[PDB]
Subunit: 66 residues, 6 copies
């Protein structure tokens, strides 16, 4: 049903450092702790809850199985 779900899940499972680029030009970095329909929880010191509607791209720091 989804390519998004298995991609994000691979990133979460493998604890791959990612860059999440926002539509406003900000780049966030961390590891994906969890996600659901509308948000991604991006972990560093604290977990930032990122609304998907604000994201342009999710870019892994290295290739991942998917």
């Amino acid at each position: 049903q989804s390519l998004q779900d298995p991609f994000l899940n691979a990133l979460r499972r493998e604890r791959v450092p990612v860059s999440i680029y926002l539509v406003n030009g900000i780049k966030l970095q961390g590891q994906i702790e969890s996600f659901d329909q509308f948000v991604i929880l991006l972990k560093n010191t604290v977990s930032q809850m990122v609304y998907k509607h604000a994201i342009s791209t999710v870019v892994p720091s290295r290739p991942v199985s998917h």
Copy 2:
């Protein structure tokens, strides 16, 4: 069903000071009083009703159980 709901609820329940970053680059601060499907009520002097569609991230000022 949701990771967003228990995260926001933990922030509300624990009265943790948060930063809510808007997609336009404004940073709001306060405590989350309540929220529903589409909005978050952010309390200081008055309660500001923030539309989720305008939010990029919600960042707690300290780690919280979730």
Copy 3:
């Protein structure tokens, strides 16, 4: 079902002056005359129909019961 509806309704009923901040950085002011699922009618000289998708926050000029 909603926190948004009773909040906007309190603002409407009590005729509280509000500021409606748009995502593009414009601040509108007036009283909320009415609202529905998608829009808020903001009254001054004429009524401006404001699409919720364009709004970041609704901020009352004084605390209101909700």
Copy 4:
């Protein structure tokens, strides 16, 4: 069910000159010829089809019954 529909319909029926402000800061002017769920047709020389998602506000040039 809607306040938006009777408002736009009053503007259409009465052929009131309006300003439609876009979220990007452009102001369009004309008369509303027609509208549906997602768009407003704004008439001058030609009819411009305006997506509601791009609109911040619709402001009549004079008060209208609604």
Copy 5:
């Protein structure tokens, strides 16, 4: 059910040159080859697939029957 569909269809059928203005201020030009629920295919050398969510207005270069 729709005013959008017959408008776009008239533009497509009559092969009228159009300007499609994006919310970010870019103006695209061409002829509408096809469209569906979410996108418009705008033809010149190649066909550009334009997401409706990115469009502010569609403006025909001359009046068209609708």
Copy 6:
């Protein structure tokens, strides 16, 4: 049901280099590896997951059958 799906699928199947223009003015380039309802996976060194809501246009580098 869709023109978007067969267009993206032709681009994927034929491995045509594309430009994906974001609403914020960034231009991404690569080949479309896969896509679903909400995202496009754009391949170069790694696969970037691009949210459709952030895309304005998808432009093939050469004409493609559709």
